[PDB]
Design a protein around this nucleic acid. Sequence first.
RNA 1: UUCAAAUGAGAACUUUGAAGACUGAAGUGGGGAAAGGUUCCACGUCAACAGCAGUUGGACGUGGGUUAGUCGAUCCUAAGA
RNA 2: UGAACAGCCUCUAGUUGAUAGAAUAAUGUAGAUAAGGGAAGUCGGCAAAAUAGAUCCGUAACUUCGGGAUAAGGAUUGGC
RNA 3: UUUGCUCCACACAAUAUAGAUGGAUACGAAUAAGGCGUCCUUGUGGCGUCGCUGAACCAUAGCAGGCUAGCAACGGUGCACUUGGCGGAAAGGCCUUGGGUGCUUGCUGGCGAAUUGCAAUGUCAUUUUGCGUGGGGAUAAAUCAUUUGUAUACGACUUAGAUGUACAACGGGGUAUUGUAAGCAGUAGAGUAGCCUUGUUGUUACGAUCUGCUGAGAUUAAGCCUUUGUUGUCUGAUUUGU
Lengths: 109, 338, 114
Amino acid sequence: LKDVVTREYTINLHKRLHGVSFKKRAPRAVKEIKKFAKLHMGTDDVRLAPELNQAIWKRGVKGVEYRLRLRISRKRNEEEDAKNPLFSYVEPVLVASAKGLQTVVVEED
Amino acid sequence: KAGMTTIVRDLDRPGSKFHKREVVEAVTVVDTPPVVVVGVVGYVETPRGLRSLTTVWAEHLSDEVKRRFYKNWYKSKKKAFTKYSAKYAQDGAGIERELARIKKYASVVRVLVHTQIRKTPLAQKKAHLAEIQLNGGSISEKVDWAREHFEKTVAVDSVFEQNEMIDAIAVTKGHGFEGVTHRWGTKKLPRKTHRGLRKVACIGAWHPAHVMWSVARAGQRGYHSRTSINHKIYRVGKGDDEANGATSFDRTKKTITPMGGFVHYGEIKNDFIMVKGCIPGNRKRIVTLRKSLYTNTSRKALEEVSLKWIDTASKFGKGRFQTPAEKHAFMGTLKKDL
Amino acid sequence: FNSSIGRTAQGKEFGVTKARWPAKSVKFVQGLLQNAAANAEAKGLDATKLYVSHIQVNQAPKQRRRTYRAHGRINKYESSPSHIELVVTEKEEKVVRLTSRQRGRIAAQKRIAA
RNA sequence: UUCAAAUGAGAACUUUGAAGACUGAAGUGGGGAAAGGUUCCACGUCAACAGCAGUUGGACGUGGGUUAGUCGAUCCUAAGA
RNA sequence: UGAACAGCCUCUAGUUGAUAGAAUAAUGUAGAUAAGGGAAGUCGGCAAAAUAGAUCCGUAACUUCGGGAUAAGGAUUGGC
RNA sequence: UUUGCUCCACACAAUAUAGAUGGAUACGAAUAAGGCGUCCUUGUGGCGUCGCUGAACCAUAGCAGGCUAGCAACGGUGCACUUGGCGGAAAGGCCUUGGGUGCUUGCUGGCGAAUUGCAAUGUCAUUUUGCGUGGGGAUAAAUCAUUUGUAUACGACUUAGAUGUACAACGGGGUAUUGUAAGCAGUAGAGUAGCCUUGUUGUUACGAUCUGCUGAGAUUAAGCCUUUGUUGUCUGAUUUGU
Ligand SMILES: [Mg+2]
Ligand SMILES: [Mg+2]
Ligand SMILES: [Mg+2]
Ligand SMILES: [Mg+2]
Ligand SMILES: [Mg+2]
Ligand SMILES: [Mg+2]
Ligand SMILES: [Mg+2]
Ligand SMILES: [Mg+2]
Ligand SMILES: [Mg+2]
Ligand SMILES: [Mg+2]
Ligand SMILES: [Mg+2]
Ligand SMILES: [Mg+2]
Ligand SMILES: [Mg+2]
Ligand SMILES: [Mg+2]
Ligand SMILES: [Mg+2]
Ligand SMILES: [Mg+2]
Ligand SMILES: [Mg+2]
Ligand SMILES: [Mg+2]
Ligand SMILES: [Mg+2]
Ligand SMILES: [Mg+2]
């Protein structure tokens, strides 16, 4: 209902990158994450945190992690909003393991 | 078509070296839940061929068969057959007149049946609708049979029996565009060949100054209609029957479903047909099983088949256990606890 | 100008199989459409009735470059520029010669069917 | 190759940061000889040019820049002229 | 690392330039694998495969006595 | 989605015509045989008659066919209203029943016609369509976009999606692959170098490896199966009318 919302998801990048050319595993993972955010938040504008880009590229172009824990926050697009007034911001969640976790609505309000 | 598995049976063929000996045979399992009769079609003979005269439908049609009449079901108002169902208002006089027209005319009678795809582990939800010819009895008796069978189900045991020779009609597995080497089986050209060796070297003489229709050329491979014949039924299994996969020699309570389910299909919850060998089409594909067009007395037909054992090991790998109980007995206690 | 271009489902609404998405052409055309709309507003025309009554693309003079080919050869490498013009307009909403016979017949009909 | 920010009417390609890579010292480093001739550098700037693009550029416009008793030439002779 | 200015990886320095996005039909180009057979292929073993470093054994015909020769043919190799 | 769509009737306008100008007038067979009528004992029967072309038969008279008066018979034809019966080869037509309502040239009268000027198709049919009038009737879909992979170069195909055996993303379980994770510990370990009160499995340091927790850990649909869990999603665009 309310448009500004933050949830933590686990994305399965292994099944999304299955059989992808090695020199484009990490770029494809970036686009896969943007598609994942658009699916879950309905926002065409998706912005990736640079520390998330670091997490994606941590083991090179070829060694993207099988699973990734993401904090996706749909926020109001202020300061001359684009075609849509909402955008998704994707951040890495510091976890020892990305296994066994379910989608949780996180609120710090 | 659900998948394929393996059986062991005694061979009964006097004069054969394997007479009264066990043979291992591949079989194809077809998931066959009962079909729903929802209409009848009358066919008249004409000097231009067989012509449909009229179609009479049942009063009530389920959503799974009404989906077949829609390209965008979720968006539609679902008006199909709503005004037709009003012909059953006072006494079904219009329905009776149409059935009388079929009885009077219509040298050929066919019923309309649809699958209960909701009883299969398919995501489709849209039932398949087909015409099936009725054989036996006069035309009036055929029309009557359809009349009392409207909106009723017909199980596969009332159509097919053990040891019967049947025919499989299905569209084969598609492979898209294919070269001549695998589409037609032509010889590969030598390694030294410039500009490609998976080709036919000469596609025609100088005359006729055209490429002949009979030359092997690249194109669509697979997704063709095929009518394969003479497949012997090995088991008419019942869905409401524990120990579907068990025989009189085995007596281990297990269904026909392999461990982990049929790969890419799921589990067999319904009645099913087990036929010797393989049939055209891939798993999940709709297939039509037809009774034999001729009487077969080849002694390979009319040979009673008694299964001794059905393989239910997992087909998702080199499955080496038939049941979870057998796996637990062999392996013992694991770190996982139940 | 469509020979050996690809096919798409998005041409169904126009009854064709060959359709594309020429972004630069679209941007130039919508720039000129914005100009025509602004001209109509300056003239005082009603914006809701406006429709593209005339649109016409002509070949502008070609702009030359050279491309280099095998065996030390040189070919033309030309742009095909455009002149575009468009006009938006507002929507808006017997002597008889009869011969003598013909006249006499008509008179006879008049005095017979009265 | 990727993410973000800045700039900009406009950014896959400009700038900065972050990351991932490569050349791996008979280098994708640092200098020179022949040759080129201002291409060096700055400011402005994008009509044309740059295998797309371009806010960038060996482009375009305007300027600035090459300091010797000791480094060379200049002198000597070589095959030669 | 290694015999090594070989190949492979890294530091200083430099670059990240070569139109891009999407999808993985046929036929290609480049790189590969293959049951059993093993040149039956083909003008022709073309192409490919097999061999390969080092240590220790063991090396024939012939010879201009210098060679042939790494002939042929075998064994060993890590870590601690 | 403009008061849209559809059927019926009449009014106008347009459109065209492979070509109205009294009637396409229905047995089946044989042809070295038949048709029709008749009779009988019902037949491959007797008798008679016919053809030798449809040159027939039926329709045919009236200002392109008007108005009006009778006579004679109760017939013939048209129009709706009708009672049914039959016809599926492409039936869409055929046979009927009963009244009404016109016409009747079956037979006798009376009035009209002219000048289209001595001919000029001299316009009399019938596909189709639109705009109107007044009377009934009904109240959807398809495509794009998204989605699946039983499909696939692209088109195409095959699936799903407006509150549910709903779909999806995760999580759980099963299935499968590999082969025993990390960490901790050990009176395991060729030993070597120290330190002691030289234990009688003493301490310290280095030590491939070994053993236990541990058929463990990891991966598992990306074109595997399953799901009483968690979190979400579910009216955007275009077009189509007899
Ligand atoms: Mg692959
Ligand atoms: Mg060649
Ligand atoms: Mg298998
Ligand atoms: Mg062409
Ligand atoms: Mg082409
Ligand atoms: Mg093309
Ligand atoms: Mg060139
Ligand atoms: Mg040249
Ligand atoms: Mg680039
Ligand atoms: Mg350019
Ligand atoms: Mg510069
Ligand atoms: Mg300059
Ligand atoms: Mg000097
Ligand atoms: Mg390259
Ligand atoms: Mg082989
Ligand atoms: Mg072998
Ligand atoms: Mg040969
Ligand atoms: Mg030879
Ligand atoms: Mg060779
Ligand atoms: Mg020799």
